[PDB]
Design a protein around this ligand. Structure first.
Ligand code: FAD
Length: 629
């Protein structure tokens, strides 16, 4: 009887197939001849964009140990070439067919296909990805559209990419939405670049809920009155967060757009602009678009007539070329029959860690958990290790399954509380999820085993990327030692991140929010760093058009759009006229000077009490996770 069948092979399945091959576990992969959206994009020459996630969070540990030299954002082309490279390695183990049905019995499943061939396997892993409405827009995208109006009812990474492609042809963009959370994908920390996922120091949640909340939530919740922040200049960007019923911040189910702020875009790409655009580095600064009026926010009930395809805003009845409805995603699951009769109903919250479904035997889901920030790789690498351990170690399988229902209840209580299920329940903070899996598997670090301040930097401030947990022990990957050293030397051992948490231990959330926005350039949505890049933007639009062979006439002027922009930007025209690093810098020198100091022996009695707090980091009081114990 076949031990393992993996259904679907694109990106998510790669690390699981790697571990099954290593333990010489019998497996067969079944995956559709048609492949994925990435194959649609490759075939039509539309791999002309870049990831919204860093190299370190987006490629697997076993590629990073070879290929990491510096932080960067991979291209779509690079992401696809990496899928194809691993597909080539495993192609002989892939049956090209499409699974229509799975009948699940007490200790095996019967797998049915479009060809008619059936398969029996003891363990079945689904790695089939999602159907996304928006994929048609991207794969079938027409660029010879110019001077048209588009209306979006949802703001997401897919909408933000479409918008980046539309604005250069003087398409006007209306967002008729209930607000959105957009975050600079890159931040300058004393003039030195950090991806946003590098600043999250998630294991500080173990110090306290309250402290981590103050550390993370001021750019998401409207907590500062600072008139430089986008959510003060453009309040239609704010969201109803009245659904949140968890002390875990940021909450499971929060989604965010990650985008290039134009100042970082300029820093990376100004010196070879057309070449970088041709590679797929596209400026997607939603905050610059709002600043310049290339995008407008309108209330979610602005008059729209779908029959005449007009939207009416102030006193102009605006013709629109296209309404883009919000991007629903659902797992591509075949029919699953419980005891080979009763349709399984999929619900993220009713699975353990998004991986283990109830009422099914030896079926696992891989790739259906979405990271709040950073790449999918962090999530699917840790899921793969979890699945591999459940499949290959009956002792582990027993330990997790014996109380599966109670684990799932305890997880939902911690992360969702009383909130009713939401379509984005599958979205998790990456650094909580990787750590959660690591503790379930036993490849976690123990904060009490930190000896030096350097060890505390590693435990609390070094990002919880999947490769962090592959340095030693059961799932060690050769070269992770050298990789962690390179990362640490490039980022000063994450001392700046560690110092951030120190600086706010004593503040309330309002003080922390003001303090967070007290910099010359704060991390996220700083509207003071837009006007200075208006000339660079015209250089950019010219370079984009050259790359794409488009002529558009800027000397033709859309007078009715100019009028709608005025109305949309009334709060900005009032708020904007009203427009940390000291401390942080002295914090870093203190910490970098006690790097090799023993923690437990640090003396009693800013500089004095920050030492005591550092000593307490050996015994965090909010460590318990009841879904694991
Ligand atoms: C436009 C776009 C941009 C993205 N940008 C990023 C980014 O910046 N960073 C990032 O980390 N992630 C990003 N992602 C998300 C994620 O990395 C991709 O969606 C990735 O393709 C997910 O891999 P997967 O293996 O889960 O699914 P896929 O890559 O979709 O592979 C699944 C495979 O299973 C096959 N299959 C499905 N159903 C069956 C069946 N019943 N029988 C047999 N075969 C089946 C499919 O044909 C397919 O080949 C992006 C996604 C999209 C669409």
């Amino acid at each position: 009887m076949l031990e393992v069948c993996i259904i679907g092979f694109g990106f998510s399945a790669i690390p699981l197939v790697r571990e099954l091959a290593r333990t010489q576990t019998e497996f067969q992969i079944i995956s559709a001849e048609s492949g994925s959206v990435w194959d649609r994009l490759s075939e039509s020459g539309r791999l002309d964009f870049s990831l919204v996630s860093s190299f370190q969070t987006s490629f697997y540990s076993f590629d990073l140990v070879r290929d990491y030299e510096k932080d960067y954002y991979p291209t779509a082309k690079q992401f696809y070439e990496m899928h194809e490279r691993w597909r080539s390695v495993y192609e002989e183990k892939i049956i090209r067919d499409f699974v229509t049905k799975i009948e699940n019995f007490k200790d095996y499943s019967l797998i049915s296909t479009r060809s008619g061939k059936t398969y029996e396997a003891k363990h079945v892993v689904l790695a089939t990805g999602f159907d996304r409405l928006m994929n048609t827009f991207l794969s079938n995208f027409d660029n010879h559209v110019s001077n048209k109006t588009f209306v979006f009812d949802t703001m997401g990474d897919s909408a933000n990419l479409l918008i980046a492609k539309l604005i250069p042809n003087n398409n006007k963009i209306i967002l008729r939405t209930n607000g959105f959370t957009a975050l600079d994908q890159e931040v300058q920390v004393l003039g030195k670049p950090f991806t946003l996922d590098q600043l999250e120091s998630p294991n500080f949640r173990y110090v306290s809920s309250e402290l981590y909340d103050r550390l993370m939530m001021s750019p998401v919740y409207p907590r500062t009155v600072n008139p430089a922040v986008s959510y003060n200049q453009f309040p239609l960007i704010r969201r109803d967060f009245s659904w949140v019923d968890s002390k875990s911040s940021p909450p499971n189910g929060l989604i965010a757009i990650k985008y290039w702020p134009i100042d970082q875009y300029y820093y990376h790409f100004n010196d070879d602009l057309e070449n970088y655009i041709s590679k797929g580095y596209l400026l997607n600064d939603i905050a610059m678009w709002l600043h310049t009026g290339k995008v407008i926010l309108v209330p979610s009930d602005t008059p729209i007539n779908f029959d005449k395809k007009t939207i009416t805003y102030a006193g102009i009845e605006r013709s629109f070329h296209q309404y883009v409805k919000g991007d629903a995603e659902q797992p591509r699951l075949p029919t699953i029959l419980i005891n080979g009769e009763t349709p399984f109903e999929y619900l993220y919250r009713d699975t353990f860690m998004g991986v283990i479904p109830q009422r099914l035997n030896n079926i696992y889901f891989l790739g259906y958990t979405r990271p709040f920030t950073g790449g999918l790789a962090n999530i699917t690498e840790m899921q793969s290790l979890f699945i591999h351990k459940l499949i290959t170690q009956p002792q582990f399988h027993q330990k997790i399954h014996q109380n599966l229902s109670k684990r799932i209840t305890a997880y939902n209580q911690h992360y969702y509380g009383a909130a009713k299920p939401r379509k984005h329940d599958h979205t998790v903070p990456f650094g909580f999820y990787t750590e959660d899996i690591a503790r379930l598997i036993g490849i976690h670090y123990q904060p009490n085993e930190c000896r030096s301040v350097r060890d505390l930097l590693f435990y609390y401030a070094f990002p919880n990327n999947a490769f962090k947990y592959r340095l030693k022990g059961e799932y060690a990957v050769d070269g992770v030692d050298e990789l962690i050293q390179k990362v640490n030397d490039k980022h000063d051992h994450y001392a700046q991140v560690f110092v951030q948490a120190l600086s706010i231990r004593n503040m309330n959330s309002d003080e922390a929010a003001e303090w967070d926005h007290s910099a010359r350039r704060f991390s996220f949505n700083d509207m003071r760093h837009k006007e200075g890049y208006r000339a660079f933007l015209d250089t950019y639009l010219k370079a984009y058009r050259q790359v794409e062979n488009i002529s558009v006439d800027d000397t033709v002027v859309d007078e009715e759009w100019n009028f709608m922009v005025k109305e949309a930007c009334q709060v900005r025209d009032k708020v904007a006229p009203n427009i940390k690093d000291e401390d942080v810098n002295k914090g870093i020198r203190l910490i970098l000077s006690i790097l090799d100091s023993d923690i437990s022996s640090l003396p009693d009695s800013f500089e004095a009490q920050s030492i005591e707090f550092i000593r307490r980091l050996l015994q965090p009081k909010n460590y318990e996770l009841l879904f694991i114990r």
